[PDB]
Amino acid sequence: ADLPAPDDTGLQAVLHTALSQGAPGAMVRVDDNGTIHQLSEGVADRATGRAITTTDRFRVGSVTKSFSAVVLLQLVDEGKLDLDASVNTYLPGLLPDDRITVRQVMSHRSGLYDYTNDMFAQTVPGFESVRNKVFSYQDLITLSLKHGVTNAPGAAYSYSNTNFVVAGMLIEKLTGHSVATEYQNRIFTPLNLTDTFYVHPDTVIPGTHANGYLTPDEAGGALVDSTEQTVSWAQSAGAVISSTQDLDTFFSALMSGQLMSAAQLAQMQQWTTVNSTQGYGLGLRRRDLSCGISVYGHTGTVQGYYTYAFASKDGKRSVTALANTSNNVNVLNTMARTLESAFCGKP
Incomplete structure (x- = not known):
């Protein structure tokens, strides 16, 4: 069926x-089937005092995984990739187990250890250590591989950034192009996402943006x-830059x-299954809401930015929320x- 009306007073209270x-x-x-709801509060730059607005660009962090998944799924459509083939079939000698498949990597069922647990054990120090570094995909995979796998192939969900570093490597090996090229073309x-970019390893966010503040x-x-x-x-696991409008367009187009x-x-x-109220597909999350509706999209975390980007099953309502x-x-x-x-909507 259809959805209750969005609750703007409830959204205002959440932001506050x-x-x-x-x-x-x-x-x-909120893009509600052609009627827009937009609210913001606070500052984009806590030093100059510039107010944040819904048009400000920002770092979407892990929402990037959905972008990587779309490219891989289009490669499946074109006959270039098989979800059930081994990762090692495409990237010889990369992983220690030939049984780990592309489908397992996409759904975080590979058992690959998450190297970010080593990198960010201490938040600020970890940030200062990597902020100005450039890594190859292999560097990150090697970091992961210093640890054993955490589970048998496909046995259970374990969120790991390594899975989407692998996804980046696959995209580049099968297409012969950088992931930036693939995101742009595909x-x-x-979608005409004019506020969306993949500029790695450039450190500047193009145009008017919200600054991120690491606690x-x-x-x-x-x-x-x-x-x-x-x-x-993070690269293919987390380096896209976008806006609320473009993520709403993207998830609505996807669904x-x-x-x-x-x-x-x-x-x-x-x-x-992730927990009682969430599931994970192939680079896509499912969240079950209190009113018995499920929404699909992805959350994102990257230093200084928290993003929620979700849409209804048919894509007619999409929401993007950002806290800097x-x-x-x-x-x-x-x-x-x-x-x-x-x-x-209103309770």
Whole structure:
């Protein structure tokens, strides 16, 4: 059936709450079948005092995984990739187990250890160590491989950035092009996403953007401006730059069937259980809301930015919410409430 009306007063309260919890700024845009809802509060740059707005560009962090998944699924449509073939079939000698398949990597069922647990054991120090570094995909995979796998191939869900570093490597090996080229040709251009970019390893965010503020691990610590970094530690797992409008366009296009064949979209929605209210497909999350509606999209975390980008099953309603801080669980939990207000409406 259809959805209740979005609750703008509920969205305003969520944003206000997130500010009280430490986010310098927060904003949300809902594309409700052609009627826009847009709210923002707080600052884009806490030093100059410039107010954040829904048109500000930002780092979408892990939402990038959905972009990588779309490219891979289109490669399946073109007959260049088989989801059930071994990763090692395409990238000889990369992984220690030939049984790890592309499907397992896409759904975080590979058992590959997440190298970011080593990199960011200490938040700020970890950020200062990698912010200006450039890594090859192999460098990151090697970091992961210093540890054993955490489970047998396909046995269970374990979120790992390594899986989407592998995805980047696959895209480049099969196409002979950089992932930037593939994103642009396959998604940015066709959808006319004019606020979306993949500029790795450039550290500048093109145009008007919200700055990101990393919260230190110690309570009461001063925020660190984490805006400009290479994001080389994430690449195909987390380096896309976009806007609320473009992510709403992207997820609405994905769910409505415009980005791949119906068969691959169905594959993308084969859910692995994450917890009682969430599933993971192939680079896509499913969140079950209190009113008994499920939404599909992806969350993103990267230093200084928390993103929620979700759409209804048919793509007719899409929401993108952004708080310009990270490493602040209160803010992360409060921002998730945007989904309840946007999709479930007034209580």
